[model samples]
Target chain A: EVETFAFQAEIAQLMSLIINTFYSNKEIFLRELISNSSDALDKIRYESLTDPSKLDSGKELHINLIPNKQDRTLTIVDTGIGMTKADLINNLGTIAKSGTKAFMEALQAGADISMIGQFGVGFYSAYLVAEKVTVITKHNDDEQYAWESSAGGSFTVRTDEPMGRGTKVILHLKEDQTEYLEERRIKEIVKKHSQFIGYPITLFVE
Target chain B: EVETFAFQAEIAQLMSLIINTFYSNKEIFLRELISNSSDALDKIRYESLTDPSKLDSGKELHINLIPNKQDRTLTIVDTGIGMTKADLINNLGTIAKSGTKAFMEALQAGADISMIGQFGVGFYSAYLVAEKVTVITKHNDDEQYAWESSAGGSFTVRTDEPMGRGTKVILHLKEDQTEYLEERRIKEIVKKHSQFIGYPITLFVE
Candidate 1:
């Protein structure tokens, strides 16, 4: 069964506030996703030092950037520590507690939000250039789940299958964001911000 | 009446991670708190534009750093948009709900993406030097509340006596963290980190 939930604490406004607030630096979305992927990879590698089974798949750990011209989407795949359904809900859906008003006004009034990205809401930056985002993942502890929407008023998390453990975050590129879908453009961004992400970041040529 | 709540999802571990993880760079805690103070000040000023009553006290909009050599404590105060009891608990103690926890995770991961200047648990850095942490705050619409994170891993929130509408974070410094109690050291850190905080920061002489 698929379950959908609403971020009722004026989160709709909070959601849009984040998408609209960034002052034109949209490429940072790629940088942010790559940073999170590295974090997840770091977690799995650290966990493997003790359990050993976490790396049992022998999957080569890396981040892959895949852009689809036909689908008009961009997928960032990380062979990292993906989450379970509880992780999907607790970690993803609920961005902040009950302070949407605090964030809404802070953004509207030109407050600095660099710290907000550090606080984990930087994921919302994906919306800045995408009409929608879909995250499909498999964890050693749980089966695959896909979190996505078609620019829906609200998003949903449903069960799915993947090759193995890791996360694939797909962004349905918005019309205004052109360069992200360009292979060469994405390569430059990765080099600019993440020259030393500690893992191979290979972008799909096609 | 007093209420007690645990940080449910390994907040204890998260708390310790923040306090113990940063090595030789505990000074960044001061930078983070000052950043938060500046943010709160910005909020109240913007809010006063529409609701005027938010600025009824006509308090000078600035951050105050008060050091007590005798008490071995440091207090960072901001006459900005403070929190109600619900907000206090929601913002600090609740891990899944608190954005600050995300900030802590980001700090742990050493993610470099910026823009989180609004809110979070970066305040936990106080525990790095402090044996205990206390927040005495009064929101414009709600009575004052005193929240303390102390000895045990859990925290407590209790109603407090009346006070101005703002926040005061008191950190009881550890023996080795003596430099924060010295006014000159604090000024140096402030001058270095918060040169353009958009508000005057005054250190108490006493």
Candidate 2:
């Protein structure tokens, strides 16, 4: 089922503030997106109480990076609780249940990272990349969905093309961000930063 | 003749805070009073432009202090435009205009000397000492007025024996505040602070 998620006015203001004030160190966006994927993996692993070995059948609860030179796209796909159509709209289209009140103040005041994070809307960090983004997913709970959007605040979503049981996030890497398309550079960044994470992060070039 | 003089309400509050917060340095109090007296003289001198030599028969536009040991009073009397009964209430009973508006903000923001002289009610610096303050004067425009008050906000106004044609402010010095009643102390303070004033400042002792 299709659903619409509308953000509060304050959330939109804070998002605009963050995007405008914080484009200098844009590479960290990759790290934050990857970390969110790791969090999703942890959530599914914890949710498998009734079916303990559901995800651990053979595949590990880790993140996979697939970079396409021909398509000029970098995909960070996660095999966690893939979103349904409504879930996609709710989670991605609008602000999630998080720090709405202190968000604008923190952004305007240029508060520290700890304070900003404490307000809770960490999920929307995806806007830093992919002039256009597409999220193809299949939920363990229901049918799959495809959510696609540019950074201009509006988004489109529909059923996926018989997608697999997880999520494939396609980031059409910008010409300026061509570094992420390099296998060696992606592997280096993952080893340096994502090494401590409990995920077997990989760089798949095809 | 009876006239009425009333200042703004906030002037009283400003005066109390000024007196209490600025008590340790009696020298500053003297400077404040002297400056106010000079302002009064300036006003009259300006008035003397239209009504040439309006000061009583060339009674110099100066300041005079009398220290009475028997009465234990440090009278800071000014030979400026005296107050009528109405002038007594307006100047002594009420507060100086515009002093209250900027006061609380000044205190909270920790505004400094840059903001000091900007306050309108600098005249109440007389309350730094003296248990009872009695202002007896006759205005150039109207009859003389006498205003007497203690630390409380209330004051009594009546026509006293006309003190010629100028303002006479008598401070009933507290026993501990007897230092102000010393002619030498008064002279040293005036010499150090008020010497540059164009008008000659006289001291009367015993």
Candidate 3:
């Protein structure tokens, strides 16, 4: 069975703001995803310090970018600490579910353009180019799950897809966003905003 | 009566991380505070759209930076939507209070350097230069309140100091952070990071 949830009111506003304003460069989506992947990779590597078996004993940590022209999909995958079902809901499902509704609403109303740049809200930067996004993740303690959204007000999560201990974000590219499928454009963006990401981001072009 | 609360585990770790890493230049504190102030100002301006009397009618929105070299204090004040006691607790006290604790813990244990920046966690960056911080604020919907902390494990909030609609952040400089007390340094940091801010940020030096 699949469970659906509404994006926090603030998140709804934020997504609308992001897709409409805030980001001037569409290529920033690649930088944001690579950064997120690097963070995930860092988590597993750090956890492996206390427990040698946290990874698959000796699996190396790296990021892979796979582009599929036929399906108009670009995927960024990482070997990092994947989320539990609860992690998916809290981290990506809502924006300040507690009480930031006012602040976020204010932010969405275009209060401060500066506030737009700070924080993990970078994840939503994906929507700048993608029409839909699908996340497949698995944590050591929890079963594999897939979360999908179309930048609409709601998203659905299913515990059906199987995966390793990490996260895979598949971006269903929009017609205008197909420029992201080109390997040259991908490398330039990585060098520009993500050169200091502290992990290897490999591009798989087909 | 005053109440004390601990920062959420991830927030605690993030602040510690921010104060220690991510920010190579200490002057970024000014930018963060100014960014926050602009956001607050933006919120109020948007609110006044529907409710004409949201703020004192026709009271202009701007930011005032009061620098006191003698007291070794620098304050950033704004005419914007101030926080309620509850807003203070959730916005400043926690960063993804749900399962992000696990993600933050992994990040704290040296999971990912990239995770260092993102989110509204920018407010806590005040600790980068100040040994102690105080926030005096009054929201239209709520009474005035004072929240203070030494960047320790906990912070205290009390319904004390009264103020108009907005927020006032007072930073008590450290012996070494005295550089921030200088008027020249404050202006340079503001121009570099906050020149694009929507509101008029005025500097009051003494």
Candidate 4:
């Protein structure tokens, strides 16, 4: 059954506090996305190890970044396990767990990570830079779907033409987050959090 | 070279809070312990997946629990990769990530998680009920060793002549927490949360 839930009621204020709190260090945004990509790679690779047919689509397990300075849009794409329309709602629209506030308390207590499974809220890292977010996902199990949201107000999801198996997340960067448009910044991020990842990550710029 | 550091200044206070908070659902201890055992098994099995010789130990991944009602001691032993004395200190005595505080905050915000994987802290769950905790370990790379501690102060580590190639943690339970020493209770806990754990768990009743 398909269902949608509002972001936990506090997420609105938490997003504002978090964005305003860490303005000095935007580098973390790249790290969060690359690490998330690494996790996707891990998931698909592990699944492939057990089910050979899963890798039959001939899709390269890689991260591709496209920074269009003209449009102020940065798109990150991964050719890994794609998400169905339902997967998008279950995966993107809702926070995964009840531990978000606990995770925030740790941050408040001055705990930062030295590299591990992200405990919580990595998705909202998009809000740190993006004025709007659009995600296009195509899953092996279902038809294509699209999800778009701004930091404020409601998100919308609708059907789309089918793409091959993968996920593409497009960020329309805020005026201030233009630094993310640099190919060098994306490369540095991949080197840090995703260098050791099982799959290769690349950037496409003009 | 190896080094050890004290828990964070707020660690003791955090510990008390986490312990008391989770104490209401005491059965989670088995789930936590079995999760650790499965992790240990995953480490070894993943190693063996590529190197066939790694499984020469001829043992399947198993978690064994011994509940001694008379002494109010509960012990869990795992036939997975063990740790050395130094390994114990490094793995148990530190919080490896800054994400834990955030993770915990998520929990306090009414997150649905039973616990977080701050790892080192997972072991400390024993302190909730135990007056003393002892670990006997033999790593594939190092000699056997014993480490003993109570929340009272510090832990002590020394060599043992011989130990099996695995880990054994013994918790000397407090009288009030002796429900942990009940075989039926411990087994029920194990079956409820950890039955799907990739490892086989056996409980030795008194």
- Highest lDDT: which candidate? 3
State the lDDT at A149 in candidate 1: 62
Write one digit per residue (lDDT tens) for candidate 4, span B1-206: 22323554444545555555644665666667776676676557545644567666545778888988776788898878887554566543343233345445656676433454432246656666677888888777677787776653355677763545778889888778887877677777775666445456778856
Worst 10 residues of 3 chain A by lDDT: A94-103
- TM-scores for chain A, candidates in order? 0.87, 0.80, 0.87, 0.83
Candidate lDDT scores, in order, read 0.72, 0.63, 0.74, 0.65
Residue B83, candidate 1: C-alpha displacement in angstroms: 31
**Total clashes in model 3, counting residue pairs 3 or more apart in sequence or in different chains:** 4
Cα lDDT of model 1 by residue, B93-140, tens digit = 442334444554555566531312222445666776788888888888
Which residue window of length 10 is worst by lDDT in model 2 chain A?
A89-98
Preferred candidate (DockQ higher): 2 or 3: 3
The superposed Cα distance between candidate 4 and the true structure at residue B176, in angstroms, equals 35
**DockQ, per-model, please?**
0.04, 0.01, 0.04, 0.03
Which is superior by lDDT, 2 or 4? 4
Docking class of 2: incorrect
Point out where model 1 deviates above 4 Å. A20-22, A98-109, A112-115, B1-181, B187-206
lDDT of 1 by residue, A46-153 (tens): 557546788975558899999998899999999998878766676444434433444445556655544345344566668878888888988897889988765435
Superposed Cα RMSD, model 4: 15.1
Where does candidate 3 clash, by residue pair? A42-B111, A119-B118, A119-B119, A120-B119
